[PDB]
Each structure stands twice: as C-alpha cells, then as structure tokens.
Amino acid sequence: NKHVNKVALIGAGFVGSSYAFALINQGITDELVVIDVNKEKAMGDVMDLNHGKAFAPQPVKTSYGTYEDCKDADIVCICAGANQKPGETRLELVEKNLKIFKGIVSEVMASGFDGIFLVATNPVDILTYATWKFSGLPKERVIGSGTTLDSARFRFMLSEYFGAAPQNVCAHIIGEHGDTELPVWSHANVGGVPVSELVEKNDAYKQEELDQIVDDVKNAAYHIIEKKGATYYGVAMSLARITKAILHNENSILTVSTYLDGQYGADDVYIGVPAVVNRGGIAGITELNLNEKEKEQFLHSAGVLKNILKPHFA
Amino acid sequence: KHVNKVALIGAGFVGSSYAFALINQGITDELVVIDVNKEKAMGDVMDLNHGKAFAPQPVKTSYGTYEDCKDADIVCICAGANQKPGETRLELVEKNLKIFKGIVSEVMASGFDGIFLVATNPVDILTYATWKFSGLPKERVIGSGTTLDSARFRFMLSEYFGAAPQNVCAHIIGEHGDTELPVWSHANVGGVPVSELVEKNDAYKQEELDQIVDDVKNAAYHIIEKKGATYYGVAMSLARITKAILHNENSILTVSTYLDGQYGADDVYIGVPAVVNRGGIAGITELNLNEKEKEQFLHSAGVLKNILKPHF
Amino acid sequence: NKHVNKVALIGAGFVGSSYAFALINQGITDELVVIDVNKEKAMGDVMDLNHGKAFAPQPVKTSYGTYEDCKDADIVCICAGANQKPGETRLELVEKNLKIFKGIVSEVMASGFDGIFLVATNPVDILTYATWKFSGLPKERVIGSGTTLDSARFRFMLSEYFGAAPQNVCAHIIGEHGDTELPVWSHANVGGVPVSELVEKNDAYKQEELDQIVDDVKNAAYHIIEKKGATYYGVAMSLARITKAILHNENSILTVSTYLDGQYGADDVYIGVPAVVNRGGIAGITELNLNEKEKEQFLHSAGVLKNILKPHFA
Amino acid sequence: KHVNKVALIGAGFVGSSYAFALINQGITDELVVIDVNKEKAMGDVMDLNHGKAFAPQPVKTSYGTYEDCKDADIVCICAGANQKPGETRLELVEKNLKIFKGIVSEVMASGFDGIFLVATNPVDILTYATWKFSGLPKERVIGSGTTLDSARFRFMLSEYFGAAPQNVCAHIIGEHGDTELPVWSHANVGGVPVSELVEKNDAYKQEELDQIVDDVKNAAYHIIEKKGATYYGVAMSLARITKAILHNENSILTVSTYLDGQYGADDVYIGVPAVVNRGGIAGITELNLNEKEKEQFLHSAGVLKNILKPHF
C-alpha cells in the first residue's frame, strides 16, 4: 500500500457488488478484497469480476478474503447489515445492526487495520457514529455516505434546469439521510447567482418547479423500490465517488456523514453536512450560515438522530 | 453533430450490468432500455439514473419500446429464454430462436438500421439467426463470440511472461463453448513467439501454458456453479465491443463473424479475429493456422453448422 | 464534420504552437490545421507535432493549410497579429491588428467557414469585437479568451488558500483583459460560504492575503516576461480549455470575452464576464449582482474598451 | 503514500516541451526544473505554473538546483552543447561528455538514488557515459533510444494495413541514427506477419513499406531543415518513457539499454525492445533476428563501441 490503493468491502449483496463493479469500471482502486460469510455468492462475484478484468481501464486485483485481509487496506467499506422489515421501527432495526457492526468493527480493528471506514448500511448516520465508538479511530477517519446521493441528484436536477454545468451549480441537501433532510436554498447559487434572485428576475424560473424538485429528490428511492424491488445502482455510484475523493486526495466537498461538535448548533452526532474529503478522511467542515427556517429544520434533523442514539449510547 | 445511441433489449443480469458498465465508462451518449417486463425495465432505468450525477460522462438513459430503436446506432440483444432445469432439451435453442424472431421483427419494423450486437447463448447460433431474421449485411450483425475468453487468455499471459497486455498477442477462436481453441501458433510475447520462450526457458514450462487454457474455457462454468449466472464479465466484453464500434477504433476482436470460406468454412458465424469499427466488421484477419488448429477449427465450425440447418 | 471535430489555427508562433501541443496532449480535437505565411516555421511545427502523434492519448491529424482549409472547421482560433512595441499605444497597436484581422476574417468567411471564432490576439476584447463586425456572425459565435486565465489562477490561489477543491471554490475576475480587470469579491465563496464571512469568523484568513493574491494575479504576465522574455504556456492552456468546452458541449462557465448589450449597465462592447460555453458558443450570460464598488470598476473597464473602439467603429 | 517526482535538467526547447507535456498529460506529481541559465528556468516554471488551474491533474512545478534531486524518482537530462557552426567537429561529443560529467556528479552528490533518463544526442553514447559517471546499476540508466522512430513506424503501419496501432507490432532497433534498422522479421499485423501480407496481396507491396522506413529515419532531419530543431516529438517520447516508469507499466519500449552479449553485442548501450517499469529496465526482449538483421545490428553496435573506446 505505498504505491497502491486497496479497498476492503464487507458485504457482497446488491450494493456491495455494484460498488465493486463501479470501482473496477472507473479505475478507482488498485486492489479490492471482498469479505462475506456467504462464500458461494461472494466467491462467485469475485470470480465474475475477475473474468472481465482485461477490459477495465486499469488492472484491478480482486479477491475473496476475511478480516485479516484488511490489515493493509486504505479503506474499509461496510455494506453488511440486516434490512428494514415492514412494521419494524428504525430503533428495532438499529438494535440488530449494532450487534452486527460490533462484531465487524471489532474484527477489523484486530487485523491491524489503520485506514478510513466508509459506512453504507442503513440508518447510515447512526451506524457511522457506532463505527466511530466501536473503532476508537479519530472522528475524521470514520465517514458515512450521508446525503451525498440526494445532494448530487438535487445539484444535477437544478443544473439541467438553469442550464449550466454541475461544476458551476451550488446546491446542498443536508441533515439526516432520510425524510428530515433539507435543501439549503439560502446558499443555492447558479454560476454564483443566488437561486432566489434567478427566480424573482424570471417567471421561466418559479419556486414550485423547485419545491417539487425537492420532493422528488426525497422520494426517488421509494419509487425505484416500488417498481423494481430494491435500489442499489445509485448508492454504489455515490460510494465510488466518495472512495475516489479519498484514494486520490481530491479535497472534494461532499455531504458525507460527519461528526459535529457544536457546529450548526448540533452536538455529538454524525450527520450530513458539506465536508472536504481527502486521503486523510475529513479535512474540514464547511459551515454554511443557515437562515432561520433551515436552522430549525437542521436541529430537528439532528434531533431525530440523537433520539435513536440515546437508548444505545451514553 | 452525431449523437451515439444504444438500444438495449433485455434488462436482466447481463443487460442491466451492461448498462451500468456503459454509464460508468462514458461510452455512449444515449441509452434506451427495452424489456417485455416493462416494470423491471422502468425500475432499472430509474436506478441507473439515480446516480447519474456521478457518471464521468453525461449519458441520457431512458425506458423505451421497440419503436425507439429507429435511430439507434447499435441494438444490443441480451434477452433470452429461461432454463426449465428439467427439459435439458439440448436444443431449447428453439425457445430462443422464437424470441429472436419476434424481437428482430419489431426492431426492423421501427426503421432501425444500425448494427446488431448479440450476447445471448448460444451466441454463434443466435448471431447467424439475427442476420437471417433481419436481412442486414453480414458486417452489421455481430456476436460477442470468444472476445471475453481471448481477453482473459491474453492478459493471463502478460502476467506469466511479465509484459503489458498491450504487448502480448494471443487469440481464442472457434465456437464460443466447448469446441473453442487457442491459437498457439501465433501467440507471442513482445515480438517473440511463445514456443521460442517455452524451449529457451524452464521458468516457462510448457504444461503451465496448457492449464491456463483450461481455466479460460471453464471460467464461466465455475462462476455459474457458485453464483447461478455470469454477468459482470460478459457485460464488460459487450461494453468493449460497443466502444470499438461507437468510437471507430478499428481494433481487432474475436467476435462472432460471418465466414466466406476464409478459414475453410463458410455460411457460418464463428469466433475469429475481425477488425471492428463504426461500420461494424471492416475486415477478417487471416491467421496461418497450423494443421492441428485447422483440424480443431473446422471441427468446431462443423459442430455449429450442424445445429443450424435443422432450423435453416 | 459529423463524427469529428476540426480546429483551424491561424498563427503559428509561441502561443499558437503551444496551443496546438496542448490540444494534442489533452486529446481535445480530432483534427487540426495550421495556417501561417511563414511556411518553413509552420510546416516545421506541423511536422514536429506529427512526429510524436503515436504517443498522444488520441490519434490527431495535423496539417499545414490555408484559409480554404477552414471550410469544415468547427473552430477557427486566431493567434496572429503584430505585437505591442515599447512606447507604442494600444490604439496604435489596434490600428495594425485591425488591418490584419480584416484580411484574416474576410478570407475565412469566403472559404465557407460556419463555426465558432476563438480570438487570442491582444487587445483580445477589441479584436473579438472586430471579428464580430468583420464576420457578420451571430455574437454568440465569436468568443475571446477574456479574463479566463486570470480568473482561473485567481480561483486556484484561493483553492489552495482555504483548502477546498477548485470545483467548490467560486471566484471571478471580470472586465477588460488587463489592468482594469476586477475581482468580484461580493460573490467569491468557498463551498457556498462567502469569502467575507470566512475572513471575519477566522484570522488565519486576513484581508491583505486576499488583496495581494489579486495584485499578483494582475502582474503574473509581467513577471514571466521579465525572466523569460515572453509568456505563452498559460495562454495556450486557457485556449485549450475554452476549445474543450466548445468541442465537447460542456456548458462550462468561463469568463470569456462576450458581447454585452445592457447587462451590467454596459452597451455594445465585448468584455470578460462569466458565460456558459457550449457547442453552439455562448449559451447564456451569468449576471452577477455587483455591489456599488464593483459596478463602478466594471463600467470604467467597459469604458476604456469603448474609448478604443470608438475611433474605429460607429 | 508515495509522491512521484521528476527532476529535469535543461530547460531548452526539449526540456520545456517535456515539462509542458507532463503537465498536460498529468503524468507526475512534482517536477523540478534545473538550468545553468537560472533566469530561463525561473521564467519557464512561472509560465508553466501560469496555466496550472487548467491542468487535468495537480502538478507541483518548481525551480530548483541540483540538491533538489535527492528525492527525485527520475532525473531527465535534456541539457547539452550548442552546435558551433565552426568546426563541424564530428566530435563535440567531447563538448557534451564534459557537460554530463559535471551534471551527473552534481546529482549523485545530492543523494539521488533513482533512475536517469537521457535525451541529449548522441543518445546512445551519452547513456553509456551517464552509467559510467553515476555508478548506478545499468537498469537504472535509460536512453530515449529509438522509441520515437519505432512508434512512428508502428503507427504508419496501422494506417497502411488498417488496424489500431494497439495490435500492430513493429520495432526499430540499433543506434539512434543512420545505422538504425527495421526488424521486418517480426513485424506483424493482428498476429499475421508482414511478409505474409505483402506477397498474399498487391494492395500491399515491399517498396511501399520500404519508403515508410526512410521517412522514419529522415523525419528529424527534415524537421531540422525547416524549423531549426525538433522538440515536440522528442518531448512526447520522453513523457511516454517517464509514464512507463512512474506508473509501473511493464511497457515494451526500444529504449537505449545495456547489452550483455544479448544480440551479439556487449558493453554497449543501444536500442532494443526492453520491458520498462518502476524499477527501470526489467527485461530485454530477445528477437530472433534473421541474418540480414544480425549483420545490420552488429554493424550498428560496432559503430557505437568504436566512438566509445577513445573515452573508455
């Protein structure tokens, strides 16, 4: 791991495998190790992914292994966990996933691992916080997927809408990855021009075309799930994106799950805010000056997370 | 300005992975997904579009129907019949021929005339069939052939001899399947034939190169044995072929090609090194097969043509 | 024309050649034709550029030609012109370059050309305006390099200074390519956080560090010219960047020279403002809401350009 | 995490273009520029940094002195003696040996322990010299050799026979200059030897591809007639060699390599296909030269050794 990057992936279901396929198709990592007690499916996938390695932009070494093989990984990405049953509450789900994560994080730490954790399993902000507690690592080195997917979709939708490149559009979705996440309209700007100005100086641009764009961003997963049974291509891409910012030391600003410590008036909680991501993990936290409405929405969002953490952590 | 468009027929494991590979690689400008099961196709398009903002190149992906093929540069067929694990029907090829008959008809009816790319098995048979059912020139119906197997082979050897695959020549030709064969006579690392390296060294034993071939030929069976299906590797090969087409690469690939007595066989689609570009097959490179290989090849071409007439 | 991009370059000196080398190294165009009456130097460069085409990321066809060879070009890039002699005024330089451009533009129009003009020669805003008048093309299809290079250097300094990726930093330099160009501080933001906030809520972030970053951006060319004798690598890169936004239809926002009639209170002048650039040229003009100071700086900048145009145009 | 670093010695036409090519291609992480003419090097670093925001990859470029070579992975030498119009002096090799002597001792004295990449002419001679003055392992001193000329060749041949250069083997070996020679015996397209294509057709004939070789050998002289110097092509070849090193490619390239009787030559640096990776030269491809090529090659190696002895 001096001239080569390695990723250990824990959990080879739909998300995990699509994530692996993405890393390979994009040439993001040099080595990938897949860890999953379901050995036949996971070795099947590893073998399938090696089958076509000749066509990838860069050669990727893919293997089946276990926790000991994490020793030299730069990143461990956890996609393992039970899935939210209908009629089950999130606290009931969290109780199951905390037990699973306790074993995983424990074993990874004992292998000698000294990299970054990247958490994908739901509820992600909760499990990111737990991985921090269980691991003993600095909070900068435990990262969750946060609202990254929703943000990027929000930012692209708008980019199509006002007609600039995404690189030029500023739009963040922040808060808990879920229903209480909020748009930061007060700071949304096309090519530097605040959205509110673009709207008022125009009736080709109207708020409802915008307030529904938000409602569609928040329901995207539910509609995918309704038509196909599950969602995983989007999540895979968002994880590949985060992995790339880390392995290639990009200092990209992404709304990953980040530990807050007083900023935005929130304490002792992992939550989606814009943060600079590099080879060391979290390099810095962007502190947007929220307007009064957003500040209340956000503290509420941080609140629903603390309500879930409180029964499980002191 | 030309906008590259692909239409995909069949959003199963192979079709879906193929799509995801195009999106991750930035290979096409537009992609349309068509499936008899409309809800799966709709759902898949939504999932693929969910992470659209993370794709390296913008790609317009949409749900479509047969008429949306009209202006497609390429139509990729990944649809096919399910196994009935009972009726092993060494045929059942009949099931698929009927599917392809109906499918090809609908796309021709839409006004399409770009290129077909066939992935379903048995790929050589169904490629021949697609040509027949479509009435397009032979250079514009293409099957995945043995491209995957040749590519494993070639790379698996750049490891063995220690060069970039870029510098290591090696093909696998014949029917995609059991009767396929390596072209040892033209295998060379750097500008240096394999047999030369075999004798003039024993870090390069001559049985170690032999076993590598068995790996390549059985790789798919082993994946199927564990997971139930292969898709990631296939999807990669398809995306590669699509890339040589859409970007006019003129790159040499052992795709399923129509033969005109060129390897002592004709009236058959079969795996052979063909040059691939925007017009489709642009040439067939003709290897000087040694006698062992001519035997293997014509036996392989025979096996295929055999299963053919009964339906043509 | 339909499956391939072509660039015609007029003028094969330091800028033009470096630009060509840049297009080739970056794989931006499929075809390049070089046009210059200095036949030996220009065929020399074409031959030199072709000598190593095998190592370029993409195969690129380079040739020596003349105006007739512009018929099927997507872009014509003009780098030809006299160079500003010591003790010569800009109005004296413009008199020379207007005569030269009159011949060049006339000849390329008569060849059948129907693409975009990209103008590099100094004074760039003046010659971009002239090329518009001489060509009869829509104003969206005549583009100058503008403050594009200074802007991007400005937006890289700050990127290294506040520690985020460039794609996350917003900072424009606008106005005349030259001494009256101004920073738009009022809209400079990191991750969406105005620079003025960042200065206050910290003092690892003082003002002068900022004002000097500007003074150094304005003088960069002069210092290169002191030590090296001439400047051309940066200019070439900025041109390749603009060319890429056009040939690949990016909708990138770039401070190219753009025709204003009314925007920012300026009429009938080409000047550097942020504009969306795509395959059709200028797609839209970002209208920043300048503060009192900036608005005055900008109209002064538009003013020194009109002072130069007025003797030459109605 | 390792940061790739390149030190460049000589910011003239070739050095400057090499730098701009590294920046445009995103090949290294850091680059230092060293020149006796301090002002020129400062100015160039400044010009190269001017457009830094536009580089595809971040690259730290700095002005430097010989001590800055300590951490350098690669040291590239593009410095050399001026023509002198006066005495044509088939020597002046003397002028340049004195330059390299001083340059190499200065870098070694910094703690440098990476790879040398030599570009100045006559490249083969100066590569030999650099290996002497440095005392490094021979696998860590590399000359540009005939990489450029082979790559042109390989390319003109992908046009002529109509394939992607990726599958069109053809080398040019020997001294970089007049006595260099094409290896027709292993020239092949898609697996098929050139001679097979020449006789088996008249769309292809052995005077067509006889002149392709003369164009290749004389290209540089023609550029020099017109413009005074070549740099763009050379800079491209250097950046390519630098890329195979820094990115551990195991690319086969006809760089200047030290020979151990390997082609009947010994104690000489000369152009042959060698595998290039992060450790430098990792192997030497042993082509089975026909008798004509053996003659040319050993004659080529003779010419070189002969220029060497008076300085041995």
Ligand SMILES: NC(=O)c1ccc[n+]([C@@H]2O[C@H](COP(=O)([O-])OP(=O)(O)OC[C@H]3O[C@@H](n4cnc5c(N)ncnc54)[C@H](O)[C@@H]3O)[C@@H](O)[C@H]2O)c1
């Ligand atoms: N390794 C393998 O993936 C495997 C193994 C043996 C055979 N095959 C053959 O290859 C085909 C593709 O493999 P897969 O794993 O993606 O199968 P799959 O079952 O996952 O998907 C096949 C898709 O084709 C679609 N389809 C069927 N008839 C259609 C029609 N007439 N028009 C449009 N779409 C139609 C189905 O809806 C399905 O989505 C299989 O159907 C099978 O015939 C595949």
Ligand SMILES: NC(=O)c1ccc[n+]([C@@H]2O[C@H](COP(=O)([O-])OP(=O)(O)OC[C@H]3O[C@@H](n4cnc5c(N)ncnc54)[C@H](O)[C@@H]3O)[C@@H](O)[C@H]2O)c1
């Ligand atoms: N086609 C060609 O470019 C060409 C033609 C004939 C000979 N050459 C040889 O190759 C060399 C490089 O080619 P070029 O075209 O860039 O020449 P160039 O004159 O443009 O650059 C040579 C650079 O080397 C520098 N230099 C000289 N001695 C040095 C030393 N002791 N330490 C550090 N730097 C030193 C010079 O200051 C100069 O900047 C030439 O000097 C010449 O010997 C090149």
